C-alpha cells in the first residue's frame, strides 16, 4: 500500500476484542495511529509503549486513537501489558492487535526482507479511511512519538484549514509558526495571489511561496 | 520495496551528472539519505531544501550523503536551485535527481494513490546498500530533518556497535542515553544475560530488557 | 495513434486549470494544435514559444487554438512563462500541459526510444475531434510555425470546400494557388470530369488531374 | 515507431530493383528520405513528385537520397513515371517502392484510420540508419518539400557540429542564422556557460540559452 | 474457403464505385464470377482481359456477371482500361476490384505462398451466394475463358434440371451431350433406376450410371 | 493450402501399393497430377476415368504422372476399375489413393463444407514438389481433361524457357501461339525491352507487353 | 501432508536455536515427536506441556525427541517456560518452535478453517525422516501422552520386528500382549501360515489371522 | 481436510444401504464417528472391530454413531462381518462403507504415500456436520478405542456446556476431574476472571488458567 | 486403449504375488487372457470362475495364460478362492489381480457408466504385448468361455500361419474349417491371386475372396 490509498477493510483480533478496521474508528468519526512493534517482551518496544502511554491522551485529545500491532497472540500481549504495570507502573489503555500470522503486517509492508516478524511501522488514517502518512523504522531503532505528534497536529490542521505546514512547523527557521498556502497552479492563480500580497493580507517570497499566521 | 531489502540497481539523471545507485555512494563506503519532494518551485519543498542545506555538513560528518528527488526535469531543478540562491541566499551543494518519468518513484512507492508526482519520501541507505529505514510524509506536511538526523546517528551506532536504541534516544524517559542489548532469542542466551547482570556488565529490568552505557 | 483516429478522451492538468480533451475545444467548434517540446528552460523550445506566441492570433482567427506540452510540472511552466515576459517582452497566453509523467506523451508517440521526455510533436485536431495531421521533429531541430500555418489553412479549406491542395499550395510551381479536385475514382466520375473539362468548369492535365480557381 | 529508433531491416521491391533498407543507403554512408503518397495517377501526389524531382540534386548533394512509397505495384509506378515524362517534361530518377499489400506502410504507421492506402508520410533516416524525424500529412494536403530541405539541412548540421537549431532557423526571429548550444544539465556545466560567456566564446540570454555562429 | 461454402459478406472498391458482395449480384438473382489477376499493366492479364470482354455478353446472357480483382488501386485500373481501349480497340465494362492491401485476396487464398499479389484465381458464385467452383492458376499461365463458360453452363443446367454433367460435356466420349442422373444412393433408389430403364425412360450402363438427353 | 506451397509430406494407401508423396514422384524428377473424385461407382467420376486413362500417355509423355483419389477403400478401387475394363473395354493403369478417412482430402481443401467426401479437385505438383496450380470442380460438374493438358503443357514450357503463356495459349486471339516475356519491373529492364524492339529481337505492344515466337 | 510421507525440509527458529528438520534428529539416529499447541500462556496447553516434561525421559529413553510448536514468538516461549518453572516447579528442557507466521503449521495442516493458530497436533517421525502417524486434536481437548507413548512403543517394535500391533496392545481383549504376523497376501503365504500352526510354532483364528508371543 | 471444516456432502454405499453423510446422522441431531481400516480379513483390523462392537453402546449412549470404511466392497464386507460372528460371537450393528475406489478415502486423506488402501483413520463429526478431530494411525499399529472415548466425551461436554478439558482428563496431574475455562482474551475478560476468583466460584493459577467442578 | 494397442506397463497386486505387466508373461514367450469380474462373492462371477478353471489347461496348451481382475482386495480374493474349493471342489490356480482402487480398471475402460466397479471385461494379449481382441460384457450376463477359446485359437493360428479365419470358424457355413487368405490390396496382388488359382493352390469366390486347407 501507499499514502492516499484507502486503509484496507480488514477484521483483526485485539486486546480490546475483535474489531472491524478501518470501520471501527471511522463510523465514530475518528482518526487512528496504527503502529507496529517487532515482538512482546522486547526492550525497545517496551520503551516505546511507555512513551505512547504517556502520550495517549494528547493524541486522543486531537481525535486520533492509538493502536499497537505485533505478530504475537493476544495472550502474550496481555501478559506483556501486565508486566508494564508491574515494573514501570503504567496501565496500557489503547487496543493492541494480535496479527497471529502476519497477514495484516504483510498486506501493509510492515515486515522486512528475510524477516518473519514486523519492524517499527506507523500508519496514520483520517476519518475518510485514507492512509495519510506512513513511517518505517527498523527493529534496532525506536521512534520519537513527539515527532509523530507534530506530524498529526499538522495533518489535522492541514485538513481543517486547507493549508500546508512548512519544514519543522511550528518552528520553521524562515516563517516561524506561520502556515503556507498551497501554491498557485494556474495563470489565473498567480494573478490572484499577486493581489493579496500587493493588496492585504498575505506574506510572499514569490507567487508560489505565500504565507500567513493562523 | 521494503526495509532490509537491497536498494535497486538503477541509473539516474541528477544535477551533478549521471550516476549509478547505490554504487555511486557505496563504492566510496558511504551511506546516503535519499529524499523526494513533490515539485520544484513549491513552498514547503523549499523550506525543506533550505532545512537540508543547513544540515548538509552534519550528515556528511557521519559519512551519510543526502540526495534529492522530484519528478521534475533537471532544467527547472537548477532554476529552482537558483531561486533558492537569489531569494534565500542559501546554496544547495547536494545532488538532486531528475526523475522525469517517475519510474524510480513508482519502484520506490513514493507516488501516492491517484497523484502524478511524488510526495515526501525518505530512504536511509547504508554502505552495503541496504534500505535501513523508509519515511513517507504527504505533501501537506514538511518533515523535520533533525528527526532524520537522530535516526541516522542511531543507525550508525546500531551497525557499528551491535546494540539497539530506545524511544526518543538519547533522551529516554526511563534510561536516558543508555543503549539496549538485543533480547535473548534462546535458552542459552538467557542464561548469559543473567551472567552479564550477575554483578557483571549490564543493568536490567529482566533478562530480555538489558541495557548498558556507551 | 495514427492520422484520422479520434483524439483520445483525456483530462489534462494545464496553466489555465484542468480541462477535458478534446471536448474543451470541440464544444466551441474549435480546432486545436497540440505541440510538445522537450523541457521548460531550454533555448530552442523557448525560441519556438516566442514564435508561436507572436503567431497566435492567426491560428485563433481561423478557429484553431494552440496548446503546448512538456514533461515538466505546471509550476515550472509558469516560471518559464514569467522568464519569457521579463526577457523576451512577450506574454504567453496559450495554455500549456504538465504531462508530469508523460502518459499523454506516451499515448501519442511523442517520446523517442531511449528518452524520458517529449520531442517536438505536433497534432492538428479538428472540431470533429479527428486528428488531421501529425509531425515528429527531434529535440535538435526546432520547427517553423508558418508551415503549420500553411497546413491548417489548407486543412480548413479542404474541409470547407471539399478540394485538395497541391504541393506547396498556394505557391505551387505548376498550378499556382489553384485547388485540386479529388481524383475521379469510377468510370462515371471519369465521364463527369471529362464533361466539365471540354465545357469546361475545370481545367485538367488528365481525367484524374482536375484543378480550378477557388 | 517513434523518432530515434532503428529503421526496420526490410527487403523492398522498387523501380530500381529489390533492395534492403536501411542497409542499401547506410552502406554507402548515405542518409535517405522515405516519403509516401496515397496513389499513382493522383494529382496532389503528382505535383509532389514534380516538386521532389526539381529538388533532387539538392538532397543528393547533402548526401541524402529520396525514395518514394505507395500501395501500388511497380508496373503502375512506371506508367505513372512515364506519364510525368510525357506530360510535365520531368524525368523521375529516384527509386520508388511498391508496397503491394501495405505491409511496410503499416509497420511505419502510414495508413490513416479506416484507410487501406498510405497518406503523406515522411521519414528522414541517417547513415547510422536511425529514424531522425517523421511527418504525417493526410491525402488532402500536399507537403512543402522546402521545409523538408530546411529540416534535413539542419539535421546534418546538428549531427555535424553538436548544436541545436532554433525555430525557423536559419531565419530565426531572435538570433537569425546562429546555432544554439545544447543546454547545460549539470551544476558544473552551468559554471562553464557562465565562464565561456565572460570569455566571449558565446552569447547568452541566460546559462541554458547560449548561442553562436558556426 | 472451400466449394459449397457461402461467399463472405464484404464491402469492396471497384471501377463501378463501392459495392457489397455477394449481395450486389444476389439481390438481382444473378450469379457472378470473380477472377483475380496479378497486376495491371501486365501482358498475360491483358490477354485474359481482352478474352473476357469478347465473352462478356455470353456470360451475361446466362445471368452470370463477371467482375475482376487485383491488388492494384482503382486509379491504376482505369488507366490500364484506357490503355486497353486505346491499344486493343476493346471497351472494358465489367467492374474490377481494387483490393488495395489484398485483404480479400488473402481470405480467398488467392495469394501464392510468399508472393504479395494475387494469382489467376477464379470463383463462381450462384444466386444464393454460394461458391460453386474454384480455380487457381499461377501468374505464368493464362486461363481459357471457354472452359469457364463450359463449366458455368453445366452449373446452370445442373442446378436447373437437378442433374450431373459428364466429362468434357456436352462433348463427352461415351455419351456426347447427354446428361447424367445423380447415382442411386439407397436400396429403394437402386430399385427405381432399374424400373425407369425397364420402361425405357432412361439409358444406363448400370443402376448407378444413368443418363439421357435433356 | 495454396499455390506455390510445398506439397505436404504424406504416406498414402494406393492401388499400386503404399507410397510416399511428393517424395515418390519428385525423387524421380517427375511432376504429378493429383485428382479427386467423390466416389467409386458414380457416373461422372467414371466418365472422368475413361477420359484420363485415354490421355494417360500424354501426361506421362510430358513426364507428369496422373494419380487419383477418392475417400473410398482400395478394395472398392479395384472392383470399380475391374468394372470399367469389363464394361468400357478400358484398363486403368494409374495409381489411386484410398484416402480412407479423407484426411489428405481435408488437409488439401478437397471436401466441400457440409460434405464428407471429396469434390473434383486437381493439383499439379512439379518435380520440386511445389503445388503449381489448383482446381476445384463440384461433384455435379465433370472436368474437361483437355484443359488440364493445356495447363500442364503451359506450366512446363514456362519452367524450361522462363516465359509466360497468354490467354488460351496456344490459340490466343492477339498473338496465337507466341509466348510472353515477363514484364519489365525496373526502369533498366524497361530500357532492355525497348532495345529488344527496334533491334527486332522481340515484338511488343508496350515496354511491358512483349512477346516472341518460341 | 499424509502418513508415510517423508518429513519436509525446514529451517525452524527454536528455544534452543535455529535447526534443520528433520535432519537435526535424523542425522543423530533419533526419532522425534512434533506437537502443536494453540498458544503460549494458555491453560490446557500448559497441562500438556507439564505432562510432556514428566514424560520427557520415557520418550528419550526410546530414542524419540519431543519438539513442540506454537504460532507466537520465541521471546514469549522463554517467558512462558519461565512461568511454568515458577508456578509449576518444573524446568522445560525440550525445544519449542516459534513458527512466527504459522508457515510450517499450514504446510503440515495444523490450522482449523476460520482460524489463525494451531490446534493440538502430533506428528511422529522416524529416524529415516518418515511421518508414521498424525494426530489432530482440537484446542478444547488436551491430549493424553500415554496414548502417544503407547503409539511410539508399538512403532519402534513394528519397525524393529516386522509385526503389527493389535487393538489396545499390550492389553488386547482377545490375544493379550501378543503381536500380529502380517496377513498372507499370496496363495503361497496362505500355505505357509497354515503349516506352522498346530504342527508349528504359532497360533491363528484363520490363515490370515496369526499371532505369537514376543 | 483439517479440523473445523464442514464434512463434505456425500453419498456412500455401506452394509445398511446407500446413505447421505453427514446428513443421515446430523439430521437426527446425532454425532458420528467415521473410521478407516486397511482391509477386510486383516488381523489388527479385526481386533479393532471386535473392540469396537464391544464399546458401541457407550458411543450410542452419547448419541455418537460409529461408522466403518475400507476400500473393500459391500459383498466381502458382509462375509467378513459373518466371519466375525462365526469365529468371535459378536454381531456387528454399525454400518461400514464400501469405498470401492478409495474415493472418499483420498478426499479425507486416509491413504498413505505410495499406497492404494486406507490406514487407520478416525473422523469425529458433531451433529452440525463439523469435523471435530482427526486421527491417522498406521496399519501396523492398532488404535486404542478407549482414548477415542475420552476424546468424544470431552468433546460432548465442551460443546454441551462451554468449557475446555485438560490433559489426561478426567485424571489430570494438576486438577484431576476439573474442567477449564477458555483463557481470557480481552482486557475486560482478564478483569472478570480476577473478580470471579476472589469470589471462590472460580479456582485459579493465574488469570488465564482457571478451573472448577462440573 | 483400443485393439492393436500395446498393453500398459503396469505393476499389479495379485494372488500370485506382485508382477509386472505385460513383461512377466511376454518375458516368457506367452500370451495372456486378462478378464475382469465385478466383485468377489458374486454368483455369476463364480459360475464363470468355475468354467474358466475347468478350461485353464486348454488356454495354457496353446500358450495362453488366464488372469483375473476385480476391484476387491487380495485378501477377499484368497477367502473367495478358498470358498470355491470348499464349495464346488475346484482349485483356482490362475493368478488374480486385486485392483484395489480400480486404477487399471479405468486405464482399460473396464468400469461401466456411473459405476464404481468393473463388469465382464476380456483382453487377449499376444507374446508381443499387443491387445488383440476385447470383450465388454455387462454385470448382468456371463461370458461363454469356449467362444474365447474359439477366438484365441483363431487368433493364434492366424498369427502363426499368415492367414485369417471366417465367421464361426471352424464351422463356417460356406467354407467349414478352411482358412482365408488376406485380401489382395494392390493390382499386382490381384494379379498374383488369379495365378495361384488356375494353378490350383487357391480356391476362390472372387479375386479378393481366396481360401484353402490348413
| For D184, nearest residue in chain B (alpha carbons) | B75
- Helix E145-161 / helix E43-54 crossing angle, nearest 10 deg: 40
E40 touches D: beta carbon within 8 Å: yes
Compute φ and ψ for C123, nearest 5 degrees: -125, 125
Q: Measured between alpha carbons, how far is G122 from G67 in angstroms, rounded to an integer? A: 10
Beta carbons within 8 Å of H61's beta carbon, 6+ residues apart: none
Compute φ and ψ for C88, nearest 5 degrees: -125, 10
Q: How far is CA A55 from CA A42, A88, A155, B144, in A?
A: 20, 15, 17, 20
| Strands C131-137 and C120-125, sheet pairing | antiparallel
Residue with cell 530480555: B208
- By Cβ distance, the residue of E42, E75, E103 closest to D39 is E75
Q: In the complex, which subunits touch H with 3 or more CB pairs below 8 angstroms?
A: A, G, I
C-beta atoms of C16 and A185 within 8 A: no
Q: How far is CA B182 from CA A38, A50, A84, F61, in A?
A: 12, 18, 18, 100
Mutation to test the F interface, candidates I185, I191, I194, I206, most F Cβ within 10 Å: I185
Which helix (H) or strand (E) is B179 found in, with range?
Answer: strand B179-181
The 3-class SS string of chain G reads: CCCCCECCCEEECECCCCEEECHHHHHCCCEEEEEECCCCCCHHHHHHHHHHHHHHHHHHHHCEEEEEEECCCHHHHHHHHHHHHHHHCCCCCCCEEECCCCHHHHHCCCCCCCCCCCCEEEEEECCCCEEEEEEEECCCECCCHHHHHHHHHHHHHHHHHCCEECCCCCCECCCECCEEECCCCCHHHHHHHHHCCCCCCCEEEECCEEEECC
- By Cβ distance, the residue of H42, H76, H116 closest to I72 is H76
Chain A and chain G touch, per 3+ beta carbon pairs within 8 A = yes
Closest C-alpha to E69, from E28, E32, E26: E32
CA-based diameter of chain I, in Å?
64
The three-point CA angle H173-H177-H180 to 5° equals 90
Q: Strands of I31-35's sheet, edge to edge?
A: I17-21, I10-14, I96-98, I64-70, I31-35, I120-125, I131-137
Contact I35, I122 (CB under 8 A): yes
Contact I211, I178 (CB under 8 A): yes
SS3 at position B4: coil
| For D86, nearest residue in chain C (alpha carbons) | C205
Beta bridge partners of D203: D211
Beta carbons within 8 Å of E144's beta carbon, 6+ residues apart: F147, F150, F167, F168
Compute φ and ψ for A86, nearest 5 degrees: -95, -25
B190 touches G: beta carbon within 8 Å: yes
D54 touches C: beta carbon within 8 Å: yes
Q: Measured between alpha carbons, how far is H91 from H88 in angstroms, rounded to an integer? A: 9
Q: Strands of G209-212's sheet, edge to edge?
A: G179-181, G209-212, G203-206
Beta bridge partners of D21: D10
Contact A59, A86 (CB under 8 A): no
Q: Measured between alpha carbons, how far is C151 from C133 in angstroms, rounded to an integer? A: 8
The burial class, CB within 10 Å (0-12 / 13-18 / 19+), for I113 is: exposed
Q: Measured between alpha carbons, how far is B49 from H43 in angstroms, rounded to an integer? A: 85
Residue with cell 515526501: B120
Alpha helices in chain E (DSSP H): 23-26, 43-54, 56-60, 74-88, 103-107, 145-161, 187-199
Q: Measured between alpha carbons, how far is E28 from H63 in angstroms, rounded to an integer? A: 85
Beta carbons within 8 Å of F27's beta carbon, 6+ residues apart: none
Neighbours of G116 (CB within 10 A): 17
Residue with cell 536501411: D22
Q: Measured between alpha carbons, how far is B33 from E106 in angstroms, rounded to an integer? A: 62
Compute φ and ψ for F45, nearest 5 degrees: -60, -45
C-beta atoms of A15 and H208 within 8 A: no
Contact C96, C70 (CB under 8 A): yes
Closest C-alpha to I106, from I124, I121, I126: I121
Q: How far is CA D56 from CA A186, D17, F146, in A?
A: 49, 19, 56
For D71-130, list the strands marked E by DSSP: 96-98, 120-125
Q: DSSP assignment, residue A210?
A: E
Q: Measured between alpha carbons, how far is G85 from G15 in angstroms, rounded to an integer? A: 15
Q: Measured between alpha carbons, how far is D15 from D43 in angstroms, rounded to an integer? A: 20
Contact G73, G39 (CB under 8 A): no
The 3-class SS string of I73-108 reads: CHHHHHHHHHHHHHHHCCCCCCCEEECCCCHHHHHC
C-beta atoms of E73 and D71 within 8 A: yes
Q: Measured between alpha carbons, how far is I108 from I103 in angstroms, rounded to an integer? A: 9
Which helix (H) or strand (E) is I18 found in, with range?
Answer: strand I17-21
SS3 at position D55: helix
DSSP-derived secondary structure for chain H: --TTSBPPPEEEEETTEEEEETHHHHTTT-EEEEEE-S-TT-HHHHHHHHHHHTTHHHHHHTTEEEEEEESS-HHHHHHHHHHHHHHH-----S-EEE-TTSHHHHHTT-S-TT-SS--EEEEEE-TTSBEEEEEEE-TTB---HHHHHHHHHHHHHIIIII-BB-TTTTSBTTTBT-EEE----SHHHHHHHHHHHTTTSSEESSSS-EEE--
Closest C-alpha to E15, from D74, C189, D117: C189
Alpha helices in A88-198 (DSSP H): 103-107, 145-161, 193-198
Domains of chain G and CATH, by start? 1-143 (3.40.30.10), 144-214 (3.30.1020.10)
Joined grid coordinates for residue H191: 478483569
The answer to whether the Cα torsion of F14, F18, F20, F26 is positive or negative is: negative
Compute φ and ψ for E132, nearest 5 degrees: -105, -15
State how far residue G46 is from chain I, nearest Cα, in angstroms.
44
Q: Residue I170, preceding bond cis, omega within 30 degrees?
A: yes
Residue with cell 454441551: H160
Q: Residue B22, preceding bond cis, omega within 30 degrees?
A: yes
Closest C-alpha to B25, from B74, B64, B52: B64
Q: Measured between alpha carbons, how far is C112 from H192 in angstroms, rounded to an integer? A: 72
Q: How far is CA H111 from CA G173, H37, H141, I101, in A?
A: 28, 11, 15, 11
Compute φ and ψ for E141, nearest 5 degrees: -130, 105
Joined grid coordinates for residue E211: 443418363
- By Cβ distance, the residue of C72, C78, C80 closest to B72 is C72
Beta bridge partners of C118: none
Compute φ and ψ for C137, nearest 5 degrees: -115, 140
The burial class, CB within 10 Å (0-12 / 13-18 / 19+), for G33 is: buried
Q: How far is CA G75 from CA B207, H30, I23, in A?
A: 10, 44, 61
State how far residue E106 is from chain C, nearest Cα, in angstroms.
24
B163 touches A: beta carbon within 8 Å: yes
The burial class, CB within 10 Å (0-12 / 13-18 / 19+), for I4 is: exposed
Neighbours of C196 (CB within 10 A): 17
Q: Measured between alpha carbons, how far is I193 from I184 in angstroms, rounded to an integer? A: 7
Q: Strands of F179-180's sheet, edge to edge?
A: F179-180, F209-212, F203-206
Tally the C-alpha atoms within 13 A of residue I40's C-alpha that lie toward its C-beta: 32
C-beta atoms of C186 and E75 within 8 A: no
Residue with cell 503381536: G179
Beta carbons within 8 Å of B106's beta carbon, 6+ residues apart: none
Chain A residues with CB under 8 Å of G42 CB are 75
SS3 at position E64: strand
State how far residue D29 is from chain C, nearest Cα, in angstroms.
21
Contact B166, B180 (CB under 8 A): yes
Q: Strands of H203-204's sheet, edge to edge?
A: H179-181, H210-212, H203-204
C-beta atoms of E78 and C190 within 8 A: yes
Cβ pairs A/B, distance under 8 A:
200
Resolution of the structure, angstroms: 2.9
Contact D33, D148 (CB under 8 A): yes
C-beta atoms of C79 and B41 within 8 A: yes
SS3 at position B54: coil
Contact G110, G123 (CB under 8 A): no
Closest C-alpha to H197, from H188, H210, H186, H185: H210
C139 touches D: beta carbon within 8 Å: yes
Q: Measured between alpha carbons, how far is H150 from H153 in angstroms, rounded to an integer? A: 5
E150 touches F: beta carbon within 8 Å: yes
Residue with cell 496465337: F176
Q: Measured between alpha carbons, how far is F33 from F122 in angstroms, rounded to an integer? A: 7
CA-based diameter of chain A, in Å?
64
Q: Measured between alpha carbons, how far is G129 from G146 in angstroms, rounded to an integer? A: 23
Q: Measured between alpha carbons, how far is H20 from H22 in angstroms, rounded to an integer? A: 6
G4 touches H: beta carbon within 8 Å: yes
Closest C-alpha to D139, from C4, E100, E99: C4
DSSP-derived secondary structure for C80-106: HHHHHHHHH-----S-EEE-TT-HHHH
Q: Measured between alpha carbons, how far is G52 from C71 in angstroms, rounded to an integer? A: 69
Backbone gaps in chain F, preceding residues (C–N over 2.5 A): none
I139 touches H: beta carbon within 8 Å: no
Chain I and chain C touch, per 3+ beta carbon pairs within 8 A = no
Closest C-alpha to H41, from G210, G166, G195, G209: G209
Which helix (H) or strand (E) is E132 found in, with range?
Answer: strand E131-137
The 3-class SS string of E66-95 reads: EEEEECCCHHHHHHHHHHHHHHHCCCCCCC
Contact G65, G30 (CB under 8 A): yes
Closest C-alpha to C156, from C181, C126, C115: C126
Contact G180, H44 (CB under 8 A): yes
Residues in chain I: 214
Joined grid coordinates for residue H115: 499406497
Beta bridge partners of D67: D34
C-beta atoms of G16 and B188 within 8 A: yes
Q: Measured between alpha carbons, how far is E84 from E92 in angstroms, rounded to an integer? A: 8
Alpha helices in C35-95 (DSSP H): 43-53, 56-61, 74-88
State how far residue C16 is from chain A, nearest Cα, in angstroms.
5
Q: Residue F194, preceding bond cis, omega within 30 degrees?
A: no
C-beta atoms of C188 and E78 within 8 A: no
Q: Measured between alpha carbons, how far is B109 from A4 in angstroms, rounded to an integer? A: 12
Mutation to test the I interface, candidates G182, G186, G190, G194, most I Cβ within 10 Å: G186
Q: Strands of G96-98's sheet, edge to edge?
A: G96-98, G64-70, G31-36, G120-125, G131-137, H131-137, H120-125, H31-36, H64-70, H96-98, H10-14, H17-21
Q: Measured between alpha carbons, how far is E81 from E85 in angstroms, rounded to an integer? A: 6
The burial class, CB within 10 Å (0-12 / 13-18 / 19+), for E109 is: buried
C-beta atoms of A136 and B139 within 8 A: no
Contact A105, A99 (CB under 8 A): yes
I19 touches G: beta carbon within 8 Å: no
Q: Measured between alpha carbons, how far is F180 from F187 in angstroms, rounded to an integer? A: 19
Q: Measured between alpha carbons, how far is B168 from A146 in angstroms, rounded to an integer? A: 9
| For D165, nearest residue in chain C (alpha carbons) | C141
Residues in chain C: 214
SS3 at position F159: helix
Q: Measured between alpha carbons, how far is D101 from A54 in angstroms, rounded to an integer? A: 79
Alpha helices in C118-202 (DSSP H): 145-161, 187-199
Q: DSSP assignment, residue A96?
A: E
Amino acid at each position: 500500500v501507499v499514502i492516499g490509498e484507502k486503509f484496507p477493510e480488514v477484521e483483526v483480533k485485539t486486546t480490546h476484542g475483535v474489531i472491524k478496521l478501518p470501520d471501527y474508528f471511522t463510523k465514530q468519526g475518528k482518526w487512528f495511529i496504527l503502529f507496529s512493534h517487532p515482538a512482546d517482551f522486547t526492550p525497545v518496544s517496551t520503551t516505546e509503549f511507555y512513551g505512547m502511554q504517556k502520550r495517549v491522551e494528547e493524541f486522543r485529545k486531537l481525535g486520533v486513537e492509538p493502536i499497537g500491532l505485533s505478530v504475537d497472540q493476544v495472550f502474550s500481549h496481555i501478559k506483556w501489558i501486565e508486566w508494564i504495570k508491574d515494573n514501570l507502573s503504567v496501565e496500557i489503555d489503547f487496543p493492541v492487535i494480535a496479527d497471529d500470522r502476519g497477514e495484516l503486517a504483510e498486506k501493509l509492508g510492515m515486515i522486512p526482507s528475510g524477516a518473519t516478524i514486523t519492524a517499527r511501522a506507523v500508519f496514520v488514517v483520517d476519518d475518510k479511511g485514507i492512509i495519510r502518512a506512513i513511517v518505517y523504522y527498523p527493529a534496532e531503532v525506536g521512534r520519537d512519538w513527539d515527532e509523530i505528534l507534530r506530524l498529526v497536529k499538522a495533518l489535522k490542521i492541514s485538513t481543517e484549514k486547507g493549508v500546508a505546514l512548512p519544514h519543522k512547523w511550528p518552528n520553521n527557521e524562515l516563517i516561524g509558526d506561520k502556515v503556507i498556502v498551497p501554491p498557485a497552479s494556474t495563470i489565473e492563480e498567480k494573478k490572484q495571489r499577486e493581489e493579496a500580497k500587493a493588496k492585504g493580507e498575505i506574506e510572499s517570497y514569490d507567487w508560489w511561496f505565500s504565507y500567513k499566521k493562523l
